[PDB]
Swiss-Prot record, chain A:
Organism per entry: Oryctolagus cuniculus
Lineage per the UniProt record: Eukaryota, Metazoa, Chordata, Craniata, Vertebrata
Compartment list: Cytoplasm; Nucleus, Nucleolus
This protein's name: Small ribosomal subunit protein eS31
C4-type Zn finger ranges: 40-63
Annotated region described as Disordered, given as residue ranges: 1-14
Modified residues (N6-acetyllysine): 23, 32, 71
Post-translational modification: Monoubiquitinated at Lys-26 and Lys-32 by RNF25 in response to ribosome collisions (ribosome stalling): ubiquitination promotes subsequent activation of RNF14, leading to EEF1A1 ubiquitination and degradation and rescue of stalled ribosomes. Deubiquitination at Lys-32 by USP16 is required for maturation of the 40S ribosomal complex.
Record cross-link Glycyl lysine isopeptide (Lys-Gly) (interchain with G-Cter in ubiquitin), residues: 26, 32
Record note on quaternary structure: Part of the 40S ribosomal subunit. Part of the small subunit (SSU) processome, composed of more than 70 proteins and the RNA chaperone small nucleolar RNA (snoRNA) U3.
UniProtKB/Swiss-Prot annotation, chain B:
Chain's role: Component of the small ribosomal subunit. The ribosome is a large ribonucleoprotein complex responsible for the synthesis of proteins in the cell.
Top-level taxon of origin: Eukaryota
Protein name: Small ribosomal subunit protein uS19
Originating organism: Oryctolagus cuniculus
Parent-record interval covered: 50 to 143 of 145
Disulfide bridges in this chain: none
GO CC entries: cytosolic ribosome; cytosolic small ribosomal subunit
Cross-link Glycyl lysine isopeptide (Lys-Gly) (interchain with G-Cter in SUMO2), where in sequence: 59
Subunit structure: Component of the small ribosomal subunit.
Predominant subcellular localization, coarse grouping: cytoplasm
Family from the record: Belongs to the universal ribosomal protein uS19 family.
GO biological process assignments: positive regulation of signal transduction by p53 class mediator; ribosomal small subunit assembly; ribosomal small subunit export from nucleus; rRNA processing; translation
Alphabetized UniProt keyword annotations: Acetylation, Cytoplasm, Isopeptide bond, Ribonucleoprotein, Ribosomal protein, Ubl conjugation
Protein's gene: RPS15
Curated annotation (Swiss-Prot), chain C:
UniProt keyword terms in alphabetical order: Cytoplasm, Isopeptide bond, Methylation, Nucleus, Phosphoprotein, Ribonucleoprotein, Ribosomal protein, Ubl conjugation
Protein's cellular compartments: Cytoplasm; Nucleus, Nucleolus
GO cellular component: cytosolic ribosome; cytosolic small ribosomal subunit; nucleolus
A GO molecular-function descriptor: structural constituent of ribosome
Disulfide bonds: none
Species of provenance: Oryctolagus cuniculus (Rabbit)
Family: Belongs to the eukaryotic ribosomal protein eS10 family.
Name of this chain's protein: Small ribosomal subunit protein eS10
Lineage: Eukaryota, Metazoa, Chordata, Craniata, Vertebrata
Swiss-Prot record, chain G:
Residues included from the entire protein: 1 to 162 of 243
Subunit field text: Component of the 40S small ribosomal subunit. Identified in a IGF2BP1-dependent mRNP granule complex containing untranslated mRNAs. Interacts with HNRPD. Interacts with PRMT1; the interaction methylates RPS3. Interacts with SUMO1; the interaction sumoylates RPS3. Interacts with UBC9. Interacts with CDK1; the interaction phosphorylates RPS3. Interacts with PRKCD; the interaction phosphorylates RPS3. Interacts with PKB/AKT; the interaction phosphorylates RPS3.
Enzyme class: lyase
The reaction(s) this protein catalyses: 2'-deoxyribonucleotide-(2'-deoxyribose 5'-phosphate)-2'-deoxyribonucleotide-DNA = a 3'-end 2'-deoxyribonucleotide-(2,3-dehydro-2,3-deoxyribose 5'-phosphate)-DNA + a 5'-end 5'-phospho-2'-deoxyribonucleoside-DNA + H(+)
Top-rank taxon, per record: Eukaryota
Keyword Phosphoprotein: yes
PTM sites of type N6-acetyllysine: 62
Positions of crosslink type Glycyl lysine isopeptide (Lys-Gly) (interchain with G-Cter in ubiquitin): 90
Ubl conjugation is among the record's keywords: yes
Organism: Oryctolagus cuniculus
Protein name: Small ribosomal subunit protein uS3
Phosphothreonine PTM positions: 42, 70
UniProt main location, coarse: cytoplasm
Membrane association type: Peripheral membrane protein
Amino acid sequence: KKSYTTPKKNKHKRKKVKLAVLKYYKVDENGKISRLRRECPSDECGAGVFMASHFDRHYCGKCCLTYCFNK
Amino acid sequence: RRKQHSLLKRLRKAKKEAPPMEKPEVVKTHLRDMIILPEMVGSMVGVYNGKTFNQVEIKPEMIGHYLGEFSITYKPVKHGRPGIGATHSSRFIP
Amino acid sequence: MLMPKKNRIAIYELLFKEGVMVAKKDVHMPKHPELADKNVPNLHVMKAMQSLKSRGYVKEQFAWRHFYWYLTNEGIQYLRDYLHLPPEIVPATLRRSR
Amino acid sequence: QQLYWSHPRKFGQGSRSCRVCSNRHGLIRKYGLNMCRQCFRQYAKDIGFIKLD
Amino acid sequence: LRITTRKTPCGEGSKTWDRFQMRIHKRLIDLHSPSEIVKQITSISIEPGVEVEVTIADA
Amino acid sequence: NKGKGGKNRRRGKNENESEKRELVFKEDGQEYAQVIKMLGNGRLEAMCFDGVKRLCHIRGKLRKKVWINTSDIILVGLRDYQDNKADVILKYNADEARSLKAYGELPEHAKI
Amino acid sequence: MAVQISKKRKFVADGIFKAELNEFLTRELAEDGYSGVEVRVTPTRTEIIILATRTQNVLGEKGRRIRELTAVVQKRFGFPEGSVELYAEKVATRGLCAIAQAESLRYKLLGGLAVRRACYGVLRFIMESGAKGCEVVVSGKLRGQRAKSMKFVDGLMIHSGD
RNA sequence: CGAGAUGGU
RNA sequence: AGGAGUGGAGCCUGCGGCUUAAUUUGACCAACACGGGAAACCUCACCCGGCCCGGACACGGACAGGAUUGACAGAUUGAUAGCUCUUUCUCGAUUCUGUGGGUGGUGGUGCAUGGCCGUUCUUAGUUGGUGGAGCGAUUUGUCUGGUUAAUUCCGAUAACGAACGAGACUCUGGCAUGCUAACUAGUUACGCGACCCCCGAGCGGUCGGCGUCCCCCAACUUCUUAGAGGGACAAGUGGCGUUCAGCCACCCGAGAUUGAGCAAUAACAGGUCUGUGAUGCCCUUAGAUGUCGGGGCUGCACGCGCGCUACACUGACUGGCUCAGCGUGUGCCUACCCUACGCCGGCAGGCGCGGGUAACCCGUUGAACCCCAUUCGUGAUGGGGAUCGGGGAUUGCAAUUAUUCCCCAUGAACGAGGAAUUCCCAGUAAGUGCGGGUCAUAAGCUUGCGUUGAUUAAGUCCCUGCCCUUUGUACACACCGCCCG
């Protein structure tokens, strides 16, 4: 029930980066395929879905609370 | 003590990483109802007061007390002179 | 997102089959009772039925902490389309009383 | 959406509220009524209570 | 059953009270008969707002 | 809440000089003044702190409500003509008058 | 119910049920001329009897509203499927029912008719219907920003004793 | 037959 | 006329003032243990910080090499809030974005309102129709007198005939050896059966005494429950009354005033928007006046209100004996109830194992004062128990600014209270303890119940007020009025 005195570390929300869709597959020869980033050893996520590569970890973005390997 | 061990990790980090024969930096917290354990002696804590953090150097005589016992929530009273309405004779007519 | 499309279809199919809906005004209970078991909260039911009312496709009433909703002829037309049902179906209420 | 979005409410004035109007002050727990005192004087005749003395 | 409440909705005035009550009346009857015929006689004149309950052995 | 006069006359709406009493400063055409004498007929003699004394009058809104007195601190509106005469706009409590002097708004002349 | 509840709780809960049902019907059937509800029990079945002045509005085009009201009463109060039946019944001597006269005066005022013309309109109809007397009162901002009230009265009217 | 003035909401 | 007091002391609790980041706020006979207001968190409105959308719908844009969603680790943070920063996986048309428009609010106005409650006001008061009187506002009816708790009756009469309040009415207390009839209530008696005592005419017995010791396929309704009827009318006798209406004493009788509920016309700038999905207008609406973490509502030179404990011998302490009534009980989202019996511990408390959804189990509800015996000896004392140190249990997510409970120690003021001032007429005042509410934990409050049980009155208008009539007025904002130098 008053006029409001304002904070000064202001953001509304962050901005989500924009990138092109797919770089996890390679064609090397006519009819030869390579998969560049690996699937996680898992029940539901065992095919077509990939672990991130960071500078010291491999991480599953789908199983996001877990599925992290320390190299 | 579910997720109240996090303060003890930050305290033992600060005890480990301080320069030799010099005091740690402050760790600052809301946890006023933490008991002083013998792990916590010779350590700097900032304990929240409802608007500010007051720093404490934990002496070993503080063992078994609460962290909130050393950081007080109010100012001691000292009186100004009484106002209108304070006594039955004090009445005002225009 | 407001809700997964899996939830939104399960509210509309239960509404179209039964012809009416009932819920209490509490956003915190984790599951709606009855055939909204298999995981949808009643917050999704309140928010779904509000969006259906402002289109004119349901009527609303309220007493003692409970909502009541009734389906109407423009809403029957819209849900039969959205659920892809045959044009001849009317599963809720049909037989004349005596 | 947050994982810590509620606090325990298994006793005290946070647990209970009126069945007619959702208010928390001056409610009646006697015989399983759970009405507010102002809502009870409004519905007492329909519930079946009377005054004689 | 008894409930006693302040009359005021807001806490002002001289301090009057309301005294509400409800009274409940109970009876028992015992019969010497087959289980097939209590089902007959316990089905007529029972139209008013009275509870009726029966148990197959208590004597 | 507490009455501070005593009578039958509960027939009004209560004064409530409380809560959001947001502090008021000058605009153009206004001055702060201290009351020097009170006359009959709803008028008074006042000195403003840049040193021009005036005869001054209670606005119709302040009648039998905001009781003015000798040595009290007030906000006054000047006239574009008839410079000897002015009208009262507000009274400051001794709690507000010290805040005006703490913001440096008053010369060191006013009594509190 | 794996073990039965005590008689004190049973008799209070049965009264709390009739109170909420009467509130729901009061605000659903207001323009349709509702005036009361009666409920009765028989083995495996509950019958609810509902009184109104314009019973065809309680039914709807082929009984739609009786089927919709049967569904929501069952859904809200937790009866098993098909154990609930609703019957509409016509009010006898509708001039001697105070609730039907309070609602018809409310809709007559809400349509913009003048206060005294409306109030003497119901006062005549109650006394022509065969009452011994009546009292009608309206209060609020009747003509201006400061509140007022009107009393309209005819015949006999008692105030004290049983 | 003691003394018994006055009136912001 | 009197009784118990209150005002004086210590402590509890509500209010003002002061203090503060905040100490949220309404209310001044008819406010102040009142908001059912006993705030650890929640409640919560106040103060310091941080996430979230739970911004319908319409129109336009952006968009399937994609509109948008979620997150590990390190830094950051009170925080395991992917809040934000670095990184690079993930989801799939549900969102995002601009404009219009909504929605919520213990925000503002009770001096814009509805509903409810209090008060004028616990007294006897109030009003049409037709007729009579006045140019009229108005008046009579609605009264000189007698009588009553009463505008209750009698009677009188330019009025006649009616309506509401009063009374009747509803609940409750006291009586029935008469009625109906009980293994969820008892008594008596015996087929009898069993333990103990010889105290008894008399044996260790048929026969006596004691029993909440135990069967009845014995008899019954006095004691308990609760349905129907009965009974009391100023009815009888003696006085007094315009001999009417009534009033006083007395016989007979369980009883010649039992106690509550409900209550008119006309008002008040009475209280409540903080009971509500009762509500107009105004304010605010994504850096929110719509959720979590910590603090405050308890802060203390001081003035006031409702209360608890006491100042002792008509007592305090330690043993022994023997008597109640009204109620509540496994929570229907919401997750907890009342307890016998056995064992461990000085105590608070702990473990085991049964009954109760209740005339069935806690329970024959072994209540306190009171009653009988002991110790102290007129001493601030073995009266009084404030203030304060140390240790142990129980509730809870959490007890420090001490939740409540138990133990040893410390041992204040206070010797019947100045001017003032409250309540009360019989199973009453006062003394004494027990249930219900609120309750995870918990009465010095409040709303009911039983137990012990007085002194003083049977009146008056003096003080403070109320009702009716005659009377005066410069008042009608109505004596808290109006008005002169």
